[PDB]
Design a binder for this molecule. Structure first.
Ligand code: SAM
Ligand code: 5KY
Length: 255
């Protein structure tokens, strides 16, 4: 049994009180106060629509994925990854999201480069034919107390994304990366498309998610086990308040 399974088993034993203190212990987060306040007032400039803009910015600013040309954003939700890419110097952003009951709807914004963005709700990516693009982003993977449900969801995402991969820049969420069948798929995918699995410091401890990014190399099993050990160790000590960082200012204007 994997270190990830032992982490999931321990996470599932936590009381709501314990879970809420564990989930942010020692993580990094952006202060969303100003953005939430502005969004509640219907302000359409500067503010990121979600924590997602800062989450993707973390990989981009480290050259792990370098968005360029036509960007496809799978599971765009409110549009945080889309509006962030829209301001990047290297042309078009197309976001798809399911929407409807229990899902986020795209939020219309006037942040920098809004005019090159089209977000489409009512779209289940599991029924979409692949489109030509220069950057493929995917942030899909719903957490579940069941690791076997999470394993099925992760494989489904990895099988779905592959036909969109054609020597392009990519950043794909891998919800549950520790299950041996997931590792098998990731290893096969890394041999063909390259890239590496990376843990984002903005991820909560309540998810084992890692992202498969195009610009990197490394041992997937080693990176996964290092994350399992990190998350397991964070159950040991009293809550460490999260490291607080500034949220992104996405500005205003057309491109
Ligand atoms: C983690 S959120 C994305 C956050 C986004 N990256 C941002 O920056 O705001 C994942 C989104 O995927 C959507 N989603 C889940 N399953 C989907 C599917 N089958 N097709 C399309 N969208 C889906 C969810 O509704 C949710 O809004
Ligand atoms: C559990 C949860 C948490 C956050 C959200 C969100 O969007 O931050 C969410 N969202 C929703 O439920 N969305 C939703 C609810 C109802 C309808 C409908 F049917 F048309 F009336 C449409 C949508 N898109 C659910």
């Amino acid at each position: 049994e994997t270190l990830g399974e032992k982490w999931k088993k321990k996470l599932n034993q936590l009381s709501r009180k314990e879970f809420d203190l564990y989930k942010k212990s020692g993580i990094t987060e952006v202060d969303r106060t100003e953005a939430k306040e502005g969004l509640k007032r219907g302000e359409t400039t500067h503010h990121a629509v979600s924590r997602g803009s800062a989450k993707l910015q973390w990989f981009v600013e480290r050259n792990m994925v370098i968005p360029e040309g036509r960007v496809i954003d799978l599971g765009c939700g409110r549009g945080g990854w889309s509006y962030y890419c829209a301001g990047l110097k290297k042309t078009e952003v197309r976001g798809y999201t399911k929407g409807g009951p229990g899902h986020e709807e795209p939020v219309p914004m006037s942040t920098y480069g809004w005019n090159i963005v089209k977000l489409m709700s009512g779209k289940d990516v599991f029924y979409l034919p692949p489109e030509k693009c220069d950057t493929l982003l995917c942030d899909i993977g719903e957490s579940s107390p069941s690791p076997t449900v999470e394993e099925s969801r992760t494989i489904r995402v990895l099988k779905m994304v592959e036909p969109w991969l054609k020597n392009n820049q990519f950043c794909i969420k891998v919800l549950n990366p520790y299950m041996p069948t997931v590792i098998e798929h990731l290893e096969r995918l890394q041999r063909k498309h390259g890239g590496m699995l990376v843990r984002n410091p903005l991820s909560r401890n309540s998810t084992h998610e890692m992202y498969w990014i195009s610009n990197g190399t490394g041992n997937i099993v080693s990176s996964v086990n290092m994350v399992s050990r990190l998350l397991l160790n964070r159950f040991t000590m009293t809550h460490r308040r999260p490291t607080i960082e500034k949220d992104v200012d996405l500005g205003a204007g057309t491109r």
